[PDB]
Design a protein around this ligand. Sequence first.
Ligand SMILES: *[C@@H]1O[C@H](CO)[C@@H](O[C@@H]2O[C@H](CO)[C@@H](O[C@@H]3O[C@H](CO[C@H]4O[C@H](CO)[C@@H](O)[C@H](O)[C@@H]4O)[C@@H](O)[C@H](O[C@H]4O[C@H](CO)[C@@H](O)[C@H](O)[C@@H]4O[C@H]4O[C@H](CO)[C@@H](O)[C@H](O)[C@@H]4O)[C@@H]3O)[C@H](O)[C@H]2NC(C)=O)[C@H](O)[C@H]1NC(C)=O
Ligand SMILES: *[C@@H]1O[C@H](CO)[C@@H](O[C@@H]2O[C@H](CO)[C@@H](O[C@@H]3O[C@H](CO[C@H]4O[C@H](CO)[C@@H](O)[C@H](O)[C@@H]4O)[C@@H](O)[C@H](O[C@H]4O[C@H](CO)[C@@H](O)[C@H](O)[C@@H]4O)[C@@H]3O)[C@H](O)[C@H]2NC(C)=O)[C@H](O)[C@H]1NC(C)=O
Ligand SMILES: *[C@@H]1O[C@H](CO)[C@@H](O[C@@H]2O[C@H](CO)[C@@H](O[C@@H]3O[C@H](CO)[C@@H](O)[C@H](O)[C@@H]3O)[C@H](O)[C@H]2NC(C)=O)[C@H](O)[C@H]1NC(C)=O
Ligand SMILES: *[C@@H]1O[C@H](CO)[C@@H](O[C@@H]2O[C@H](CO)[C@@H](O)[C@H](O)[C@H]2NC(C)=O)[C@H](O)[C@H]1NC(C)=O
Ligand SMILES: *[C@@H]1O[C@H](CO)[C@@H](O[C@@H]2O[C@H](CO)[C@@H](O)[C@H](O)[C@H]2NC(C)=O)[C@H](O)[C@H]1NC(C)=O
Ligand SMILES: *[C@@H]1O[C@H](CO)[C@@H](O[C@@H]2O[C@H](CO)[C@@H](O)[C@H](O)[C@H]2NC(C)=O)[C@H](O)[C@H]1NC(C)=O
Ligand SMILES: *[C@@H]1O[C@H](CO)[C@@H](O[C@@H]2O[C@H](CO)[C@@H](O)[C@H](O)[C@H]2NC(C)=O)[C@H](O)[C@H]1NC(C)=O
Ligand SMILES: *[C@@H]1O[C@H](CO)[C@@H](O[C@@H]2O[C@H](CO)[C@@H](O)[C@H](O)[C@H]2NC(C)=O)[C@H](O)[C@H]1NC(C)=O
Ligand SMILES: *[C@@H]1O[C@H](CO)[C@@H](O[C@@H]2O[C@H](CO)[C@@H](O)[C@H](O)[C@H]2NC(C)=O)[C@H](O)[C@H]1NC(C)=O
Ligand SMILES: *[C@@H]1O[C@H](CO)[C@@H](O[C@@H]2O[C@H](CO)[C@@H](O)[C@H](O)[C@H]2NC(C)=O)[C@H](O)[C@H]1NC(C)=O
Ligand SMILES: *[C@@H]1O[C@H](CO)[C@@H](O[C@@H]2O[C@H](CO)[C@@H](O)[C@H](O)[C@H]2NC(C)=O)[C@H](O)[C@H]1NC(C)=O
Ligand SMILES: *[C@@H]1O[C@H](CO)[C@@H](O[C@@H]2O[C@H](CO)[C@@H](O)[C@H](O)[C@H]2NC(C)=O)[C@H](O)[C@H]1NC(C)=O
Ligand SMILES: *[C@@H]1O[C@H](CO)[C@@H](O)[C@H](O)[C@H]1NC(C)=O
Ligand SMILES: *[C@@H]1O[C@H](CO)[C@@H](O)[C@H](O)[C@H]1NC(C)=O
Ligand SMILES: *[C@@H]1O[C@H](CO)[C@@H](O)[C@H](O)[C@H]1NC(C)=O
Ligand SMILES: *[C@@H]1O[C@H](CO)[C@@H](O)[C@H](O)[C@H]1NC(C)=O
Ligand SMILES: *[C@@H]1O[C@H](CO)[C@@H](O)[C@H](O)[C@H]1NC(C)=O
Ligand SMILES: *[C@@H]1O[C@H](CO)[C@@H](O)[C@H](O)[C@H]1NC(C)=O
Ligand SMILES: *[C@@H]1O[C@H](CO)[C@@H](O)[C@H](O)[C@H]1NC(C)=O
Ligand SMILES: *[C@@H]1O[C@H](CO)[C@@H](O)[C@H](O)[C@H]1NC(C)=O
Ligand SMILES: *[C@@H]1O[C@H](CO)[C@@H](O)[C@H](O)[C@H]1NC(C)=O
Ligand SMILES: *[C@@H]1O[C@H](CO)[C@@H](O)[C@H](O)[C@H]1NC(C)=O
Lengths: 439, 48, 123, 123, 123
Amino acid sequence: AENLWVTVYYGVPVWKDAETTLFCASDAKAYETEKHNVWATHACVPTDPNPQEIHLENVTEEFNMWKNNMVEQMHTDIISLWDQSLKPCVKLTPLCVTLQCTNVTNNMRGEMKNCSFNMTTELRDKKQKVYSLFWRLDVVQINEYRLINCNTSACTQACPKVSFEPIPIHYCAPAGFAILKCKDKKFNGTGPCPSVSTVQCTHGIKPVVSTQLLLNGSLAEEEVMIRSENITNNAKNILVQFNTPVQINCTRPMNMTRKSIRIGPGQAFYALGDIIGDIRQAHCNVSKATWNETLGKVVKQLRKHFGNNTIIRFANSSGGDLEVTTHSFNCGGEFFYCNTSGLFNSTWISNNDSITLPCRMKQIINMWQRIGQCMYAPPIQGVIRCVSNITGLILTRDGTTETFRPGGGDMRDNWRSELYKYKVVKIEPLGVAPTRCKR
Amino acid sequence: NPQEIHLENVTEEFNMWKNNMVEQMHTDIISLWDQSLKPCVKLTPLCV
Amino acid sequence: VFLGFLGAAGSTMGAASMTLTVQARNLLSGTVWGIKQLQARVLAVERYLRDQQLLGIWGCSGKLICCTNVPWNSSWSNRNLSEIWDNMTWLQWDKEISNYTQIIYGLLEESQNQQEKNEQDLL
Amino acid sequence: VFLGFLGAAGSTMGAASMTLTVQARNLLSGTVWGIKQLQARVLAVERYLRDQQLLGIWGCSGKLICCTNVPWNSSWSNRNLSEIWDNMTWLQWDKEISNYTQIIYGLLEESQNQQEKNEQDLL
Amino acid sequence: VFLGFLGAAGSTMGAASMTLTVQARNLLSGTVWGIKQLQARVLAVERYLRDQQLLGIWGCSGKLICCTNVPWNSSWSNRNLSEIWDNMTWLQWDKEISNYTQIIYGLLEESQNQQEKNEQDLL
Ligand SMILES: *[C@@H]1O[C@H](CO)[C@@H](O[C@@H]2O[C@H](CO)[C@@H](O[C@@H]3O[C@H](CO[C@H]4O[C@H](CO)[C@@H](O)[C@H](O)[C@@H]4O)[C@@H](O)[C@H](O[C@H]4O[C@H](CO)[C@@H](O)[C@H](O)[C@@H]4O[C@H]4O[C@H](CO)[C@@H](O)[C@H](O)[C@@H]4O)[C@@H]3O)[C@H](O)[C@H]2NC(C)=O)[C@H](O)[C@H]1NC(C)=O
Ligand SMILES: *[C@@H]1O[C@H](CO)[C@@H](O[C@@H]2O[C@H](CO)[C@@H](O[C@@H]3O[C@H](CO[C@H]4O[C@H](CO)[C@@H](O)[C@H](O)[C@@H]4O)[C@@H](O)[C@H](O[C@H]4O[C@H](CO)[C@@H](O)[C@H](O)[C@@H]4O)[C@@H]3O)[C@H](O)[C@H]2NC(C)=O)[C@H](O)[C@H]1NC(C)=O
Ligand SMILES: *[C@@H]1O[C@H](CO)[C@@H](O[C@@H]2O[C@H](CO)[C@@H](O[C@@H]3O[C@H](CO)[C@@H](O)[C@H](O)[C@@H]3O)[C@H](O)[C@H]2NC(C)=O)[C@H](O)[C@H]1NC(C)=O
Ligand SMILES: *[C@@H]1O[C@H](CO)[C@@H](O[C@@H]2O[C@H](CO)[C@@H](O)[C@H](O)[C@H]2NC(C)=O)[C@H](O)[C@H]1NC(C)=O
Ligand SMILES: *[C@@H]1O[C@H](CO)[C@@H](O[C@@H]2O[C@H](CO)[C@@H](O)[C@H](O)[C@H]2NC(C)=O)[C@H](O)[C@H]1NC(C)=O
Ligand SMILES: *[C@@H]1O[C@H](CO)[C@@H](O[C@@H]2O[C@H](CO)[C@@H](O)[C@H](O)[C@H]2NC(C)=O)[C@H](O)[C@H]1NC(C)=O
Ligand SMILES: *[C@@H]1O[C@H](CO)[C@@H](O[C@@H]2O[C@H](CO)[C@@H](O)[C@H](O)[C@H]2NC(C)=O)[C@H](O)[C@H]1NC(C)=O
Ligand SMILES: *[C@@H]1O[C@H](CO)[C@@H](O[C@@H]2O[C@H](CO)[C@@H](O)[C@H](O)[C@H]2NC(C)=O)[C@H](O)[C@H]1NC(C)=O
Ligand SMILES: *[C@@H]1O[C@H](CO)[C@@H](O[C@@H]2O[C@H](CO)[C@@H](O)[C@H](O)[C@H]2NC(C)=O)[C@H](O)[C@H]1NC(C)=O
Ligand SMILES: *[C@@H]1O[C@H](CO)[C@@H](O[C@@H]2O[C@H](CO)[C@@H](O)[C@H](O)[C@H]2NC(C)=O)[C@H](O)[C@H]1NC(C)=O
Ligand SMILES: *[C@@H]1O[C@H](CO)[C@@H](O[C@@H]2O[C@H](CO)[C@@H](O)[C@H](O)[C@H]2NC(C)=O)[C@H](O)[C@H]1NC(C)=O
Ligand SMILES: *[C@@H]1O[C@H](CO)[C@@H](O[C@@H]2O[C@H](CO)[C@@H](O)[C@H](O)[C@H]2NC(C)=O)[C@H](O)[C@H]1NC(C)=O
Ligand SMILES: *[C@@H]1O[C@H](CO)[C@@H](O)[C@H](O)[C@H]1NC(C)=O
Ligand SMILES: *[C@@H]1O[C@H](CO)[C@@H](O)[C@H](O)[C@H]1NC(C)=O
Ligand SMILES: *[C@@H]1O[C@H](CO)[C@@H](O)[C@H](O)[C@H]1NC(C)=O
Ligand SMILES: *[C@@H]1O[C@H](CO)[C@@H](O)[C@H](O)[C@H]1NC(C)=O
Ligand SMILES: *[C@@H]1O[C@H](CO)[C@@H](O)[C@H](O)[C@H]1NC(C)=O
Ligand SMILES: *[C@@H]1O[C@H](CO)[C@@H](O)[C@H](O)[C@H]1NC(C)=O
Ligand SMILES: *[C@@H]1O[C@H](CO)[C@@H](O)[C@H](O)[C@H]1NC(C)=O
Ligand SMILES: *[C@@H]1O[C@H](CO)[C@@H](O)[C@H](O)[C@H]1NC(C)=O
Ligand SMILES: *[C@@H]1O[C@H](CO)[C@@H](O)[C@H](O)[C@H]1NC(C)=O
Ligand SMILES: *[C@@H]1O[C@H](CO)[C@@H](O)[C@H](O)[C@H]1NC(C)=O
């Protein structure tokens, strides 16, 4: 009656923040992509055609994109996706031989090398006098050349069957856990979210390994978004998300050749033969009309944080390592490294053609800072062309006015631009509460 | 204990040419092979 | 009104208690990287048999709702019946009673252990 | 007459219901290739707690047999009592009611969710 | 007097039966070498659902204590009530009844299988 008794309730809406082992989901046409397991999807779970989504009315839960563990579990998963794909692939241990190299047939600036070397054939007897063709970033001289990795990391050659094409990846959580999706149009990834909804598996997140220029990411809503961990600190990167995508084209207009010198028994190295056609380099195009309006759309957002009548300038990379300074990205297999001195050369005050960007190329790579050893991606025949979406930028600030320069390096930032609206909780269905019942 | 129970009155349609115990037996014997050769002596220098 | 899984998280505890069967239906749900899901779908059922074993050793066994002969102490945030079940949510509530949850869990499994031995006498 | 596991698969549903405890006793049963059995004996218990959780959220909990306050709809193959329990087998039956099994499963867990909240009133 | 896990192993069966909830609370408890614990914490729950399934198919379901309508045979070590519950321990007892445990386990699950079918008649 007037004295109250405890009661057990099982299946209550009660959750606390926690971290659990997250898994994958990836449609079923992605499994038809096959091609000897492209990237990750093998025994991974297929996505059911039910996409369940439940808007939790009245609920307000404080997110935090800069402390989100789906990042550390996505980064380290992609790290180990790399290595599992290289363990049973051909290893280039006997490819650290002395390279006698020359220019490329031109008529100027040297960019490529026509290299000849000795080589183990299939038999452990007679050698082989065969020639390859390496970019300048692949090799280095010694006082005659050698590969640029031989004085560091033992090397392994990417298998030619697998594809480095970013496919959608849906992360999930098991039973007793759930994932919350914030669904408002203006959220800097930190603080309380008014319209919280719950989901079982996130939207398709293509793991695009890029620097400086965010590629093929989710578009922002209404106004372009400016996200930072500490805007007063000039030591934290400033994530940007676009509303309108910026169109970027990139060709590799060199009709190159694939030579297959057999370093048997079994294994076989894929080199670059003679070049069919003109000596050109790879270039990425950005339309001059799109990049001017999108640049001013960001700086009106930068005035919201750095003073109303302030002057915002942009310059290229301060320097240091190669990856930080260039727009590193994959498309068609090759790895481009592009100069963004032309996309960040602006000075904004308080109030019809293309922008072509020079791109290098490299076969031997050490990805995500230090992981996965080297990897000599095999050469690619024909003219490679691909279009990408610029859906965000990675900017840094220098230490009246303020300047901003592009950055990257740490690959945990690329995931945050897709995981800002997600977080992980555990369901605690056992809550006690009083009422006037007794047994 | 070899337990065996005759299900009287029951009639069930088999199909030997669509049986998955085959595909799970073949691919098991396939991987029985390789697991038995991974830590064995490799004749790479015997192509002289 | 099937609002869905956790559909009544901002609804009052009285309002949410109509959804108790909607949060517990989806509580169990039925080479590397393929083990990401194994070591995680194992952690999904130990979480279940940890909760069900509390429901078992209390006077509940059968699910969803269940009373106990433990008197509620006034120092566990002394609200009223109309201040809890008509003006509070389960998230907001387990925040005040997060200090006392472990204290309370003992009495339920001990007050029930007195009831069963007394049950064997009267048989 | 202990016919054994699935011993009454061709026996009538009335005849088979005497074996219900013989089919459910052997339902749970207590380096690579050694994982063939691990990932399979894990799939052997999720199959168990998926069924037991339906038995739990219905008016059953306790096993083998159990009634419900759901009226049986005539459009679910309108047979008679002597046409089902004396002239049909469980295999033959779940063939006609394979279309409606998912429809029916909802009512049991919802008709039971109305009974428990009403149970808390009358306490 | 919470003696602890197995705290009453030398206490009489009557004395130990007050600890039944202290031995069953800690019965479930919530790259290589990291699999030493996985294949062992899996063997920790099959041990649980093997015991709970016997408790389920008997007249117990609900835990700790539970009667049955099986008459106790005199040839299973004919002691008296004051010779068992006041002068013997559970270890010492299951030593005399280790021969008959399998014989007895059958009657409980069959005497219960007669009770449920009779229960469906009288409904
Ligand atoms: C942001 O997102 C965009 C959109 O997804 C993405 O653009 C994609 O660019 C890549 C280039 O890196 C494109 O990939 C290649 O496209 C060409 C052209 O395909 C034609 O043919 C298809 C018919 O299937 C038509 O539908 C299509 O319209 C074109 O006309 C293909 O030739 C490529 O195929 C090869 O790669 C596939 C996967 O890597 C393999 O499955 C396939 O078998 C091919 O491999 C082999 O082919 C030959 C054997 O027959 C062999 O000789 C070759 O040497 C090779 O080994 C590939 O599909 C992709 O299509 C673009 N996306 C779309 C939707 O078209 C951007 O790249 C992305 N941005 C970033 C930074 O990633
Ligand atoms: C990177 O560097 C390597 C250097 O090793 C280049 O590879 C060489 O490329 C040249 C092309 O100029 C090749 O030279 C040519 O060889 C042809 C093959 O000769 C065969 O035919 C005769 C029968 O007459 C056989 O007896 C003989 O054994 C061969 O089987 C010749 O036909 C070519 O002759 C032509 O060019 C000369 C040029 O003066 C003309 O005068 C002639 O009339 C005729 O038209 C020519 O000599 C050479 O063989 C290649 N070497 C190897 C090892 O393959 C790569 O091309 C280079 N890559 C790039 C991109 O520059
Ligand atoms: C092959 O390459 C050579 C160079 O190695 C090319 O010859 C070069 O031709 C350019 C013009 O096309 C010359 O530049 C000229 O300089 C004068 C100043 O003296 C200026 O007034 C002109 O307007 C022009 O800019 C350059 O001097 C000349 N170099 C040499 C070494 O002769 C040649 O055209 C190329 N041919 C092919 C087929 O590739
Ligand atoms: C590939 O190997 C051959 C040996 O078969 C090298 O030829 C020798 O080169 C040295 C100097 O480099 C000379 O002194 C010898 O007279 C050469 N002939 C022999 C040993 O028979 C050849 O230089 C190598 N090619 C390279 C390293 O690019
Ligand atoms: C391996 O070789 C590379 C290239 O020769 C070395 O990288 C150079 O490191 C110095 C550090 O003082 C830089 O100034 C050069 O610019 C680097 N070269 C290039 C091409 O980037 C690397 O240090 C060597 N590693 C060793 C010897 O352990
Ligand atoms: C992200 O946005 C939130 C608002 O959604 C900002 O929160 C405010 O922070 C200031 C301090 O900088 C407080 O004085 C306000 O009371 C906060 N308001 C709200 C509604 O949270 C937060 O500062 C923003 N963070 C960044 C890095 O931009
Ligand atoms: C690049 O951006 C364009 C935006 O125009 C994307 O095209 C849109 O895709 C969404 C769904 O992905 C559709 O709902 C829109 O209707 C599309 N726009 C138009 C004009 O048809 C395109 O998918 C993006 N490509 C990427 C991210 O790879
Ligand atoms: C790049 O060069 C190759 C030759 O190595 C070209 O392949 C030829 O393609 C035409 C028609 O496309 C065929 O008639 C020839 O028989 C092909 N030759 C060989 C050796 O296969 C290829 O077309 C060139 N790339 C482009 C874009 O034209
Ligand atoms: C990037 O390439 C695409 C196509 O490869 C270009 O889109 C074409 O634009 C022209 C007009 O400029 C149209 O006539 C074509 O129909 C378009 N093609 C398609 C497939 O839509 C685009 O303009 C290029 N942009 C840049 C910046 O290079
Ligand atoms: C950033 O852009 C500046 C130009 O705005 C580049 O500065 C040049 O650097 C080279 C060194 O290779 C010097 O020889 C030139 O004299 C410099 N020009 C000026 C005007 O100072 C700089 O190299 C660029 N850096 C990057 C990383 O792209
Ligand atoms: C990236 O682009 C900048 C500018 O477009 C390049 O800077 C040039 O450097 C050379 C030195 O070899 C100078 O002679 C030019 O005057 C510079 N250009 C300008 C506009 O100042 C730079 O070399 C390019 N590459 C890198 C890696 O920064
Ligand atoms: C940044 O942009 C300015 C112009 O917006 C470039 O200025 C060039 O200046 C020279 C003479 O000083 C002119 O002859 C050129 O025509 C100007 N370029 C253009 C595109 O108009 C400046 O070089 C750019 N900086 C970099 C590093 O590229
Ligand atoms: C390659 O080209 C560059 C152009 O600057 C030249 O200096 C170098 O000597 C060339 N290499 C050879 C081996 O001729
Ligand atoms: C941001 O940076 C400033 C200065 O670097 C520091 O004083 C402050 O504590 C940081 N964190 C904030 C403002 O949350
Ligand atoms: C386009 O960019 C130029 C700089 O080259 C700038 O002066 C101009 O204001 C921009 N146009 C608009 C409409 O912002
Ligand atoms: C900047 O100026 C606009 C109008 O000129 C004003 O609405 C806005 O509040 C100002 N922002 C400040 C003062 O931070
Ligand atoms: C109720 O809580 C108080 C502490 O606020 C404690 O002293 C008291 O003993 C508790 N009541 C019972 C019956 O234990
Ligand atoms: C719970 O206890 C902590 C200290 O252990 C105290 O700070 C907090 O105020 C308590 N919570 C409530 C709701 O009283
Ligand atoms: C019984 O089934 C029919 C469909 O044949 C359906 O229209 C009817 O609503 C069902 N009865 C109830 C009470 O829902
Ligand atoms: C079950 O439904 C299917 C179509 O969904 C129909 O073809 C079949 O006849 C139905 N089964 C029975 C026993 O009526
Ligand atoms: C009791 O045990 C004896 C064996 O000592 C056995 O012969 C007898 O049948 C048992 N009682 C019953 C009712 O089965
Ligand atoms: C149990 O049976 C064994 C033989 O199976 C016998 O040796 C032993 O004495 C029996 N135990 C008791 C307590 O009678």
